[PDB]
Design a binder for this molecule. Structure first.
Ligand SMILES: CN1[C@@H]2CC[C@H]1C[C@@H](OC(=O)c1c[nH]c3ccccc13)C2
Ligand SMILES: CC(=O)N[C@@H]1[C@@H](O)[C@H](O)[C@@H](CO)O[C@H]1O
Ligand SMILES: *[C@@H]1O[C@H](CO)[C@@H](O)[C@H](O)[C@H]1NC(C)=O
Lengths: 206, 206, 206, 221, 205
């Protein structure tokens, strides 16, 4: 307890919180998705509901410590309210995201942070064709709402969405699921914006 | 980090929050809308549901700094709770607005602030005629709930609503969308009342 | 800004909050309703849903100032959390009231406060007869939940509910709308208890 | 104002909050219910929805004062967050209770507190038979979630639920409504557990003087 | 009151909060479920809704006291916000869990804590076959979201779910209900992850 209390106190009570990235000190956040269930489809509104979790990973110099100074502690868990977290947003949501997991992150001695929120999301998707065998494809972009690619860069570790927690008796079967970094220009703005595009092809289960 | 922490501390911890505008020190807030989706229509209640975001822009002397004094930082992101924000309200909503984006603003060295909330709104609209080819027109006014035009003046940069993120497979197709400043004067009251009128003509997609 | 910051600091940071009215220092609160829409009727549950706003007005000696001492400021806006507000409650609601407007009040140099919350309310109402031409009458009382008439007296400025923001294409048409002070006496207790009874006669629009 | 500010400051800012009752310093809470409306019935889920308020009353030595020391103040209103309140819970709810009234209590100079929250509750009830003339009976127990009868004793002032605010045009008509203290014993445990059982018999119903004075027998103290 | 106020002040205001378990100071949390009602089934979405409460139990050295020093107090009740609590999560929920009970725990002089939240849960379950006599089986895992088995170990006191508060007039009848500790290993990662699997077989009454 004592060593950990002391570490948390040195990292959090001895200087102000990390104020977020800038042009001069940009930050890279890695995302990966873990699909759990397509819960429903609404063909009268073109909304589809997904349950998933999302691994977010980034690294801050101000969260580093030497384990020899703190009883060989190499990592700890802490409330997400204690640290900065990136403002990753689904760009085509139609309802506020519902949080299904505790807001807690893992911080490691090299300054890396891992945060894995689970979420239910409603997003814009025309499910016409879902009852066929070819199925239907939908997409949703995830991006920083307020930071450009000059401040936050996104990436993936893999292009394949992990389906190993996908609910075997879902009403919908996943044909494919990818997650792809894109660098986007908009007409408003010279700065690039980075997103991760989640593309899911699915159909009604046999 | 250090320069930014120092700037945030100088702007926010060294004086009280901006107490809002008055008759003598009025403020101009610029709005623009970015329609993303008409999600549904309810002809039994005369409610229509819209997903959009809204750019809000204003400028405060108390948020100015010289970038040479702060390592050449020209802008930063910060939680909307750290600053004053205007109380722009949809006058004909029928439900609390659902927030779809992080509550974060961009503050620039000239004291200008940009806040871009994304929202789902239910508002009063008779959708009779939507299945026709002429479609239907609905309107919603946006105004300060408690500040008159002597304290907050609202403006638009353009009269055309941005439709470049409108969902291509929405059930509803946008025929036109405008956003127009209106100034009202009433016999009861010396104060002008300002609103921005969002007028949208739409119909069922072919 | 500076004069206003100073006024707010003198009124709010230099003494404890007004602890509410007593027998010895009673208060009068004036209410008026502004009906905007009867959104729906549910004849299987006898609930009706109304959207409206409510003007509340009262006066405190502790909110007085001399404008000459504060740069001629005669009024300001402030968050309702900064001040005491009366606990006016709809006695026959069936759901928590949904707030549609920012919780901000206007305070004037004579100590008077104006607070105008907009609300969606579900309340107990048998809509049988609404499809007829005579329509149907429903009523809802608004009262202080915990203060007697010795501490808070309610009144209206007029007995006519204002209908000038009523939605012209509502499914329901207002035939009449009144707001009337009533005094309730309990045999146990000398104190009167006050309510304002909102009585609305309405029917389906032609 | 000044005397009241001073009283609130002496009662709340000068010592820690009452930490709740114990075996050695137990407390009695008195409940009564005031049924307002059976709003609906769901026969596909066996849930029924009620709107009511609930008078709760208890007394603490730490909330006592002498009115002569405080300008003859005998009572005041205050936010429920300023005081300890009992954790009375509906044992068979199926949704979080929705609060319909401001969270404010009346505290009196003898240390007694009166708190009257209004609530919408969904609870477990098979409504089969509601469309008949015999109607249907549902029950829900209200109890302390964590305190035994050694720490909190519950009681009622009357066994009859007050129906004077019951909505006359509800879809459902009340045949009877009682509220009854019960003592529950479990074989594991010496401590009694107290509840108040709200029993309502009702059925589907079959189917002007808005006057400036109204007379009653202050329910929502 | 006085002795209790003093105890609470010594345990909570005189040192920082317990920062949670580590590899070096792990913790065991014991769970048991008390099913109250299967409220509904949705066969178009494969979601089922359960109402239950959950007994959680663990023990901290930092919550110990000697009753002789505090007027013979052996236990007290306190708001769950005053203490660390484990981040036990239903892994296959489809909506945020709705809390039905006050967030209050019992702390005992040996440092043990008992916390019993009541909850409504929507979770992933195919109810096909529920109208038959064999009924249908569904399952939901409960686990620490962020702590591995090196930091938090879960266990049960019994493998039988307690059904003594089950609603006699539910639309659904419980055929069986078990709760079982499981250890999960992933090939990427050396640390085990622990869950308690709640398995419920039920049918229309
Ligand atoms: C994540 N999204 C990216 C960046 C913010 C959010 C919404 C989109 O931005 C804009 O519309 C504008 C940005 N800057 C502007 C300037 C003038 C007009 C529009 C914008 C794209
Ligand atoms: C604090 C700091 O880095 N100051 C620099 C300054 O040296 C440089 O001359 C200028 C370029 O105009 O940018 C800024
Ligand atoms: C106050 O009013 C006087 C008289 O009109 C005026 O001269 C003065 O400028 C006002 N004060 C301020 C700070 O505006």
């Amino acid at each position: 307890q004592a060593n950990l209390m002391r570490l948390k106190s040195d990292l959090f009570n001895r200087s102000p919180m990390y104020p977020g990235p800038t042009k001069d000190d940009p930050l890279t956040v890695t995302l990966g998705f873990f699909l759990q269930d397509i819960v429903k489809v609404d063909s009268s509104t073109n909304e589809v509901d997904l349950v998933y979790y999302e691994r977010q990973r980034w690294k801050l110099n101000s969260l580093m410590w030497d384990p020899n100074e703190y009883g060989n502690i190499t990592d700890f868990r802490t409330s997400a309210a204690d640290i900065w977290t990136p403002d990753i947003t689904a760009a085509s949501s139609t309802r506020p995201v519902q949080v299904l997991s505790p807001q807690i992150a893992v911080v490691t001695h090299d300054g890396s942070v891992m945060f894995s929120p689970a979420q239910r999301l409603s997003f814009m998707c025309d499910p016409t064709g879902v009852d066929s065998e070819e199925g239907v494809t939908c997409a949703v972009k995830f991006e920083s709402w307020v930071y450009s690619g000059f401040e936050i860069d996104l990436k993936t570790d893999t292009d394949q969405v992990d389906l190993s927690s996908y609910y075997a008796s879902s009403k919908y079967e996943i044909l494919s699921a990818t997650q792809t970094r894109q660098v986007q220009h908009y007409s408003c703005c010279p700065e690039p914006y980075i997103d991760v595009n989640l593309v899911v092809k699915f159909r009604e289960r046999r």
